[PDB]
Write a protein that binds this ligand. Structure first.
Ligand SMILES: *[C@@H]1O[C@H](CO)[C@@H](O[C@@H]2O[C@H](CO)[C@@H](O)[C@H](O)[C@H]2NC(C)=O)[C@H](O)[C@H]1NC(C)=O
Ligand SMILES: CC(=O)Nc1nnc(S(N)(=O)=O)s1
Ligand SMILES: [Zn+2]
Length: 259
């Protein structure tokens, strides 16, 4: 009943226990830039005050599938069809050995990791769950991460505290910090398209936005992420790695680019 990225209950058998995962518009996908359709009318994505997370501690949790961070309802994502509000944010990465841990690809190439910022249509619904199964109910920002030659102070707000939640279900609080700083500096270039959640139930309720520019973290940081979290509640511990879903069929969906 507890699904996993691989194994007997890997992303291959998801469609069985969660039919929706076999939908006609799943995510992530391999974004082929040659098929990308330019749309000069796509308004700039703009995170209103994502450096203003207030005063109260943010919740840093360990699913067993990822590291998730809570976000204040004060973060408002503009530039989209409806008004969205930030709810949570989490990461995806590969195992120690590999350097491919992102969920989306660009022209068949994946990066070291991926950041996902989840929003919901608070304009039309009252909860994140409510919009999780409503058309266009969710909106996710996808930031691809590469290994840089320098330590990223932004990402440390999260990485520096990974030991506090080494085991699954372990929780903790962090001093609020500028989320904005976790995105690439230039957000003009991006791709948009209709998709789904990348984990069961795989609800096809999300409006995706994947940035063209990438964010960077030191090989040290990427390592501290790969080799620190366990996917179990206690010992024996089992490395929570390779937590990304494979590119899904495009099923003839159009993918727009702002550039
Ligand atoms: C995501 O899917 C929705 C619905 O399938 C698309 O909405 C339609 O968009 C076209 C052109 O933009 C309009 O003429 C239709 O009226 C829209 N349908 C309605 C009323 O929802 C939307 O364009 C898709 N988003 C993208 C660009 O991927
Ligand atoms: C309840 C909820 O928000 N679930 C999500 N499941 N997968 C998500 S992801 N990886 O597409 O951002 S969000
Ligand atoms: Zn995700």
């Amino acid at each position: 009943h507890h699904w996993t990225y691989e194994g007997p209950h890997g992303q291959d058998h998801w469609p069985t226990s969660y039919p929706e995962c076999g939908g006609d518009a799943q995510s992530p996908i391999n974004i082929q830039t040659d098929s990308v359709i330019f749309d000069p009318d796509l308004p700039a994505v703009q995170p209103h005050g994502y450096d203003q997370l207030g005063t109260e501690p943010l919740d840093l949790h360990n699913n067993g599938h990822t590291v998730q961070l809570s976000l204040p309802p004060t973060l408002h994502l503009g530039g989209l069809p409806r008004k969205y509000t930030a709810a949570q944010l989490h990461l995806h990465w590969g195992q120690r050995g590999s350097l491919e841990g992102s969920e989306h690809h660009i022209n068949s190439e994946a990066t070291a990791a991926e950041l996902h910022v989840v929003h919901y249509d608070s304009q039309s619904y009252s909860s994140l769950s409510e919009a999780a199964q409503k058309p266009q109910g969710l909106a996710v920002l996808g930031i691809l991460i590469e290994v840089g030659e320098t330590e990223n102070p932004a990402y440390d707000h999260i990485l520096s505290r990974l030991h506090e939640i080494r085991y699954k279900d372990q929780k903790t609080s962090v001093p609020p910090f500028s989320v904005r700083e976790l995105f690439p500096q230039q957000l003009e270039q991006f791709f948009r398209y209709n998709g789904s959640l990348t984990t069961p139930p795989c609800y096809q309720s999300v409006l995706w936005t994947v940035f063209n520019r990438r964010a960077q973290i030191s090989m040290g940081q990427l390592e501290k992420l790969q080799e620190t979290l366990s996917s179990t509640e206690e010992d024996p511990s089992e490395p929570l790695v390779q937590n990304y879903r494979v590119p899904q069929p495009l099923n003839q969906r159009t993918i727009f680019a702002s550039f």
